[PDB]
Amino acid sequence: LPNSEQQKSVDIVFSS
Amino acid sequence: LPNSEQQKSVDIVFSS
Amino acid sequence: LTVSLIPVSGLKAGKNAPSAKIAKLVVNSTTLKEFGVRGISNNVVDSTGTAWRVAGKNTGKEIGVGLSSDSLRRSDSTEKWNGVNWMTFNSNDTLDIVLTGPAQNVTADTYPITLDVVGYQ
Amino acid sequence: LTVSLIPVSGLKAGKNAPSAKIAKLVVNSTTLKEFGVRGISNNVVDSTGTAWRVAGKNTGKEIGVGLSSDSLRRSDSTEKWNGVNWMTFNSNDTLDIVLTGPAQNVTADTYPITLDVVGYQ
């Protein structure tokens, strides 16, 4: 079902 | 403009 | 489908544990029973798009990310869509994104993580 | 955007010419001036998704496909969308898909070719 496709993105943070 | 994205597909045929 | 991708808090630079969690993927649907998921990057390192490399924004250094071993085992099937392999899972389910493989020494940075999720019936 | 992907006729198994054309990609838009394009497969062989491998349906054998050298030189820019490299071209334009690299000996088969095209302003 190609019309239910989506790209999802987040930033992952590694701290000192 | 992610809402103008599309996947397009065709078959390529190599004959003997 | 409604999707969330939620970062894990408290992540520290340096040697991390093998399979250290870094994000949770939530997928919900009132209509579709299943979803396929692939990682999106310039360097996908396995044939199902379930392991890939991400580069840091400030340093440009790469880490290996992917679905956890346990998440992979919950897969319903692997499908082929236009020739491409897509592992499928039950909708209304969470999956773990981890640092893949053996312990990684991670440089302090922000690392973008991108996935394609698709509905399947 | 309106996209067509049109196979080249008369393709023969055996040794083909270097950069032998196999498909034409047509992209038109009344609103957007540019488009990005990436190949879609389980084996993308360069960092911009402009070279990749496709497997035959009946034999499972792989060929190398990608944008022609000449098509690549018409690119306006390379952009970064969520970390991923996308070469961009003028809309209202055609591009050639070819067998990449040195002469390939191609086994007789049907080979699916899949691309993502996106609009850019």
From TrEMBL, chains A, B:
**Highest taxon of source:** Bacteria
Q: Please state what the protein is called.
A: Outer membrane protein
Q: Which organism is it from?
A: Salmonella typhimurium (strain LT2 / SGSC1412 / ATCC 700720)
| Shown residues in whole-protein numbering | 30 to 45 of 170
